[PDB]
């Protein structure tokens, strides 16, 4: 997690303008539509057969909000992402059996969703800073797999 002061500021800047309720819903939704493979983990969310069924599914929106909340916690502890995410790491491994490769996919759809929402604000230097963050969060979620 090589984040200069300017990256950190840029990241935190932008994040304060993020409506997490809605951004988490869009992010987990788009993940499940763009990468149908990641639907094997949410069979209980009911119907995911089309784009609208997925994006508007209330269980998807609620879950997405949980995910983004954890993400939020991580941004308040950038210098200790492994400790902060350690219990979530063992869960996704031990109980949920999630291949960590999926963490990078979600990380990338989140970058696109941020770009979608912020347009010309999501400049290259800012995207570059969020790419470091999403990579760090995925490695920290990966750290306790065994």
């Amino acid at each position: 997690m090589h984040l200069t002061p300017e990256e950190k500021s840029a990241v935190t800047a932008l994040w304060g303008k993020v409506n997490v309720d809605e951004v988490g819903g869009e992010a987990l939704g788009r993940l499940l539509v763009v990468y149908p493979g990641t639907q094997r983990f949410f069979e209980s969310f009911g119907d995911l057969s089309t784009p609208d069924a997925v994006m508007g599914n209330p269980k998807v929106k609620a879950h997405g909000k949980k995910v983004l909340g954890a993400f939020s916690d991580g941004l308040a502890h950038l210098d200790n992402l492994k400790g902060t995410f350690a219990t979530l790491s063992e869960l996704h491994c031990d109980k949920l059996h999630v291949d960590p490769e999926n963490f990078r996919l979600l990380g990338n759809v989140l970058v696109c969703v941020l770009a979608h929402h912020f347009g010309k604000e999501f400049t290259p230097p800012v995207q570059a800073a969020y790419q470091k963050v999403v990579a760090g969060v995925a490695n920290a979620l990966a750290h306790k797999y065994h």
């Binding site: 763009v34 784009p51 970058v111 696109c112 912020f118 999501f122 290259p124 230097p125």
Partner: protein, 141 residues
């Protein structure tokens, strides 16, 4: 594979890109060089600074090639033939890098096309870029 709906979605999206395509390709390369520095290793003979003409110029060629791929969406492997020999055999670009450029194009289009980049279209463009990446990479070691 690219289904009918997918093809329609890609034609309408690229359609709306229009004359702004070169500039988008150009921003896509800048995003890539900055977010994923390893990719610069393929462009040492280039001036890689903000606003560089060589990057603008290269962005245009990348976009023209993508327009041509959409124009020949049903025969991409033969239409991108020359580009496949260049990337896989002359240049030997490792496939991970295509994923990084594809991600960066999706970010560029998302940032410039709010109303067209719905979920469904997003999935289609992602599928299209993967197909194009597979063609450009299939003879590689």
């Amino acid at each position: 594979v690219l289904s009918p709906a997918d093809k329609t979605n890609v034609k309408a999206a690229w359609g709306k890109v229009g004359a702004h395509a070169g500039e988008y390709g150009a921003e896509a390369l800048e995003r890539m060089f900055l977010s994923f520095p390893t990719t610069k290793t393929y462009f040492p003979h280039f001036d890689l600074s903000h606003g560089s003409a060589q990057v603008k110029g290269h962005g245009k060629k990348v976009a023209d090639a993508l327009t041509n791929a959409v124009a020949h969406v049903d025969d991409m492997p033969n239409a991108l033939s020359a580009l496949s020999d260049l990337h896989a055999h002359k240049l030997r670009v490792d496939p991970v890098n295509f994923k990084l450029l594809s991600h960066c194009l999706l970010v560029t289009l998302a940032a410039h096309l709010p109303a067209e980049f719905t979920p469904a279209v997003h999935a289609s463009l992602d599928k299209f870029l993967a197909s194009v990446s597979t063609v450009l990479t299939s003879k590689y070691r």
